[PDB]
Symmetry: D3
Subunit: 70 residues, 6 copies
Amino acid sequence: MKLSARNQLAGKVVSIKEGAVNGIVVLDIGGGNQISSTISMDSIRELGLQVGSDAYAVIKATSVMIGIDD
Amino acid sequence: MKLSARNQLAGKVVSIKEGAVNGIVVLDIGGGNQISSTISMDSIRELGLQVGSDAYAVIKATSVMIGIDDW
Amino acid sequence: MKLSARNQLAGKVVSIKEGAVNGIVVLDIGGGNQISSTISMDSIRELGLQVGSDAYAVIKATSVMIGID
Amino acid sequence: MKLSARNQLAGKVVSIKEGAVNGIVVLDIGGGNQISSTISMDSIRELGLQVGSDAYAVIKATSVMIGIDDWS
Amino acid sequence: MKLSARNQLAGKVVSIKEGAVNGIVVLDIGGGNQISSTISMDSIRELGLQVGSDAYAVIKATSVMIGID
Amino acid sequence: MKLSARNQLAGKVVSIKEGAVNGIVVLDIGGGNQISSTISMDSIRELGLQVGSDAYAVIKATSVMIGIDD
């Protein structure tokens, strides 16, 4: 599928923290940036995610806030 | 001032497209990646955002999905 | 791409409301159900969406609430 | 309450996966479609949800993305 | 309808900014707090919102972040 | 940091429900109103949140729906 989400950032899985219904996936997207994703354990298994998997952090633009230094 | 959001990615504003009540801010976060943010025009004005401003893309972890090529 | 979003519902575009930076796409997903999506105009253009296009409504499970009567 | 969310899809609960603080409710909304909802266990209990319960999948329009096929 | 959303805060509409497909509604929920909501123009009209309307700010718990000084 | 999120409501933590990867923090914002927040356990630990802590409920405007009596 091709998605409307304005943010689709390629990266490598560096860690997966497993929970009961959700887990947290951390993706190294390069340049010293990492993105954490809280998704269903079901999806983590269905996408075959492991440490080292190539993947994408997918973020709808309406979910992104802008911050600045004080 | 300090936020629970797991994702707070520093970058520079490269573009601002103004809309009626919302605008879209694009941030260069380095490593060849850009992030687009759809936020209120009032916030764009209140934060003083301009092309070239230093800022952060702030994303709650529950807002991030994972995709794969799945070839 | 294959996506983690639990909800990926096939449908046909029945209307597109064009706005300034966002638009609203309505999808007929069958069963008498329609889904409205508020997305960027840029994405509406890049995906080539028109009335009659085949598409999918994609929703992360953490975005779905449950209501009852 | 009457809610602004553009998407309020009636369906029947087909499964509930209970966890420690959250659960996943799956709704059959007809037409061969199901919707999964990740919500708090407290909300699942307070709403009295059971398999077979009549309910609604409620989705704000700004939460919905559009996808197309890879060859499109 | 009764909703799973953990946050349902009563208030009065103090401002409405109209846009193309969305508008922003400001609700004074008492105690000096106001909540701003960006929703479709269609919903603003369908709910009959005006300055002075009684309404509720409805927020899913997974949408709320915590900040500290 | 200063954030674009239009909703930033001060309160005190009244309860924290712990899970494996997420927890639910309840904030008393006064006036008989409480706000529940489902966030990562890692964030709850990093922010030092306790029962009694002073904090803020932070909500993006696009995450807020409006309801009315019917």
